[PDB]
From a paper:
A dataset to 2.5 Å resolution of the seleno-methionine derivative of pb1(970–1263) collected at the selenium peak was used as input for the phasing procedure. Fifteen selenium atoms were located as expected; the asymmetric unit of the crystal contains one trimer, and each pb1(970–1263) monomer has five methionine residues. After solvent flattening, an initial model was produced by automatic tracing, which was improved manually. When the monomers in the pb1(970–1263) structure are superposed, they align with a root mean square difference (r.m.s.d.) of only 0.3 Å over 269 Cα-atoms; even loop residues superpose very well. The structure of pb1(970–1263) resembles a bullet. In the mature, chaperone-free structure, the third interdigitated region does not contain any regular beta-structure, although there are many inter-chain main-chain hydrogen bonds. In the mature fibre, we do not observe density for the catalytic Ser1264, suggesting that this residue is removed with the intramolecular chaperone domain upon maturation of the fibre. More than 90% inhibition was measured when T5oad was incubated with pb1(970–1263) at concentrations ranging from 0.015 to 1.5 μM of the trimeric proteins, while pb1(970–1396) does not significantly inhibit T5oad adsorption at the same concentrations. These data indicate that the pb1(970–1263) domain likely binds to the O-antigen receptor. An attractive hypothesis would be a receptor-binding site in the groove that becomes exposed upon intra-molecular chaperone cleavage, and this is consistent with the results of the phage infection inhibition assays by competition with pb1(970–1263) but not by the chaperone-containing pb1(970–1396).
The well-studied Siphovirus T5 has a three-fold symmetric tail-tube, to the end of which three long, L-shaped fibres are attached. These fibres are made up of a homotrimer of protein pb1 (pb stands for “protein band”). The L-shaped tail fibres are responsible for the initial recognition of certain Escherichia coli (E. coli) host strains, binding to the O8- or O9-type O-antigen of the bacterial lipopolysaccharide (LPS). The bacteriophage T5 L-shaped tail fibre uses an intra-molecular chaperone to fold, which is then auto-proteolytically released to yield the mature protein.
Residue numbers in the entry:
A (entry chain B): 989 to 1263
B (entry chain C): 988 to 1263
C (entry chain A): 990 to 1263
Write the structure that this text describes.
């Protein structure tokens, strides 16, 4: 049944995996520094390796200036053998969470942990490594997806994606937090490979501060951005301003409607267009 | 102060294994607890009966020569409750999805739910599309499941973002071709829902689309808004912003701007004459 | 390798036991147990683990509180275990907090909820009603979700999908039912006003426009802003269920302004209806 560690003076009771390089050399980048793992029973044996596991791995060859390490969790899909086990959860040394379900990456890329390393293993990728350390990366064939499942019970189904702007920083000892600043933005939009590389988003919805905030003024706008055919510049086209004006984001430039997609009728209180 | 270390001094790996069988040396079972690691904390003179925080390995499918199926969950216990009401709030499915199921969200009878497939099974009136399994992150919370993106300025700019990353090709094979964003690339943000029989497709959305295949000096996009009419179950594009920035209706002679009791106040345009 | 076995096909589990000082009850955020790689420098191991799973107490333990939570620690390439990062926190309430390098000081290593973050950083004041709602990502400046969507043989179709229903999975009954009216899916921005975070002040929302049934599932899409000098987020412009693009109030919101005019308007009727 059970197997314990105890610490009766109320110190902590911890388990450690120790591991070296070949010939007492320093441990290596992506070397498996330790692991915990179910092996299940086939009938008369156990599986050769674990079918579900927590792995600790090195990030960089270890040294006096690098104790780099990262984590991953491995699962095995119903109806496959541990040959096709999947390191689906990767907690990068930088702290990003990569989520890589079955189908998404070949097991030769099992040790990919960052955009930097993905760029290395797949030289045609070329995604912006400045995006490393920014949080959650999901990789799935075709249709990577977030599902927000929202039973009413007794109130309201209100799933939400909520950006939270503030001034200041939680990274230092000071820990000033302060009022939302101008040029605060919340972009939802699409980057993509142009055949050379990924770069900046080229179509977006953005929610922006339109102003610095204080406790009785919190202006926002909502802006829609596209990129023109033959361009690589994402441009604001239409926004809703803080006063609720729907507008083009530049004067004398963008139509409403076109010849083969005309508005059916316009309702405005003033019957005269103001030019 | 009291450490317990496995060591491998030739620089092999040093791993820990949980071994587990079925009854009477039978093959291990679906959702059978194949192993576990777990804090038990001290009440005053005893430990809790089970762990209050734990990593569990579980079987997915009865084990066999063609099924080594396994999955993971992490259990926590909320402040002010006993381990009776401990919560398997992190579930890493055998398909590789992450399910995130906080306190309040699922009854503990559904502690072993690991996919839309199994959720449909346990809750027969659910009927959600199991084709969505394997797609990444599922969050389940009563009423208000939520992603919070907390964005301190420090010295630059509060710029939280949700960023789709379109490409051609695949990371799943050995070739590993990656290539230019294709046409009919999309990034949909929208709402599915139960119709009283089932969940199905989204019925209102914002989408960012490729409007074109891409290359390094042309990366066209559009943004499109979709709704479903009362009495219909068809989600339809209504208004978009095109790659040239035209705000338009997504069909000719069909959608109004304004209505009788919600009129625009004034229109500003350079041409004072509507083109018909 | 080091294996525990259970040959009668009971379960084979590993337990960390831990007490308070002098056989006292274990404490809030006390490290109740752990598993941790220590790697080899050349002639020694690192002093603590460079990657680890920690179990911690939530609340002083008691007959009515067995509170516990989990975190995973990593160490970034080119730094020592001094600057290791508890980047994954699974709160006692069940939320997942994701806190990469650069995001929080190590003094806030034990932060596990908005409640406890408010405590450690008294100027924060974020709404603790948001605890238990799922995923919180904290990064300096640019917290981000990336959805990476290789075509292979079909279509690049990344998606963020709200799933409305009636009923509840929390009880034993487990009624699930049709999407109700005032169902919403908001994507938008809260922020500090200099006192506190509160509700979102600009948003896109997808709404139910109606209760649903198996032949009618109406939606609208609505854009909300807040005016300069206000703290009220207000619907401004929506796309209705019939596809009408409208202002969300009569005689109130312009299309265009004097220094940002539409270039041309195309409509079938050449006469504005007033």
């Amino acid at each position: 049944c059970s197997f314990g560690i105890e610490n009766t003076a109320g110190g902590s009771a911890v388990f450690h995996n120790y591991t070296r390089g070949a010939s007492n050399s320093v441990t290596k980048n992506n070397q498996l520094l330790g692991g915990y793992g179910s092996r299940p029973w086939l009938g008369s044996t156990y599986t050769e390796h674990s079918n579900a596991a927590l792995h600790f791995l090195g990030a960089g060859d270890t040294s006096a200036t690098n104790h780099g390490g990262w984590i991953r969790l491995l699962v095995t899909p119903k109806g496959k053998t541990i040959s096709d086990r999947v390191p689906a959860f990767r907690l990068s040394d930088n702290g990003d969470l990569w989520l890589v379900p079955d189908g998404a990456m070949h097991s030769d890329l099992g040790l990919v942990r960052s955009i930097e390393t993905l760029n290395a293993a797949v030289p045609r990728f070329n995604a912006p490594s400045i995006q490393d350390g920014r949080g959650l990366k999901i990789v799935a064939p075709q249709a990577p997806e977030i599902d927000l499942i929202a039973p009413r019970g007794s109130g309201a189904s209100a799933p939400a994606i909520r950006a939270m702007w503030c001034d200041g920083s939680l990274a230092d000892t000071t820990r000033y937090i302060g009022a939302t600043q101008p040029g605060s933005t919340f972009y939802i939009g699409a980057s993509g490979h142009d055949g050379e590389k990924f770069d900046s988003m080229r179509g977006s919805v953005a929610i922006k501060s339109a102003g610095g905030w204080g406790p009785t003024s919190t202006p926002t706008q909502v802006v829609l951005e596209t990129c023109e055919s033959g361009s690589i510049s994402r441009l604001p086209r239409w926004g809703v301003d803080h006063n609720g004006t729907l507008m083009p984001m530049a004067d004398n430039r963008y139509n409403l409607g076109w010849g083969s997609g005309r508005v059916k009728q316009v309702y405005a209180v003033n019957g005269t267009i103001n030019t």
